[PDB]
Amino acid sequence: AAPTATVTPSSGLSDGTVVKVAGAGLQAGTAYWVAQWARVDTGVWAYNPADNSSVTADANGSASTSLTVRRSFEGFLFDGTRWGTVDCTTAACQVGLSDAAGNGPEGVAISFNHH
Numbered sequence: 001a002a003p004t005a006t007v008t009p010s011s012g013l014s015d016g017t018v019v020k021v022a023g024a025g026l027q028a029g030t031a032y033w034v035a036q037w038a039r040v041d042t043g044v045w046a047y048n049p050a051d052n053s054s055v056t057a058d059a060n061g062s063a064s065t066s067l068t069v070r071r072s073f074e075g076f077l078f079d080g081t082r083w084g085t086v087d088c089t090t091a092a093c094q095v096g097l098s099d100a101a102g103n104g105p106e107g108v109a110i111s112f113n114h115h
């Protein structure tokens with residue numbers, strides 16, 4: 001089972017929508033942070049610590065939890081440095097699982113309601 005992550009719903013989201021985040025093929029017994037990310041610049045991503053969460057992969061490398069997404073949020077860099085406001089209406093945002101060393105499967109892109 002290859003490392004993968006699934007997020008649903010992933011489209012038609014609103015600020016406050018709760019999504020299901022699931023991971024498979026992960027490190028058995030490893031704790032994974034669940035967070036919303038955004039590419040704030042080429043090769044630069046910021047996340048939303050204000051609504052982050054954590055989940056530990058089971059003996060089978062599977063995990064699943066919930067996450068509240070935000071249309072816009074105060075983004076922080078990987079090292080905790082404050083970046084600034086991020087608007088997922090335009091910015092490319094995703095939800096991802098990452099362990100303490102920054103490893104984990106590819107994040108899943110998300111989009112918000114346009115109405």
Ligand SMILES: C[C@]12CC[C@H]3[C@@H](CCC4=CC(=O)CC[C@@]43C)[C@@H]1CC[C@@H]2OC(=O)CCC(=O)O
Pocket residue numbers: 033034035047049052053077078079098099100101102103
């Ligand atoms: C940034 C990091 C991976 C992403 C982590 C971060 C700790 C805090 C954190 C909380 C979240 O909600 C998402 C993941 C994340 C933002 C980790 C601390 C070290 C780890 O990265 C590395 O081990 C390698 C660092 C590097 O390559 O310089």
Ligand SMILES: C[C@]12CC[C@H]3[C@@H](CCC4=CC(=O)CC[C@@]43C)[C@@H]1CC[C@@H]2OC(=O)CCC(=O)O
Pocket residue numbers: 037043044045078094096097098101102105106107108
């Ligand atoms: C931010 C990050 C690189 C970009 C990652 C992010 C985890 C979530 C994520 C999922 C993707 O599929 C796209 C990249 C990305 C958004 C990582 C968590 C730690 C890692 O970073 C660093 O270790 C050092 C900074 C860097 O690599 O530029």
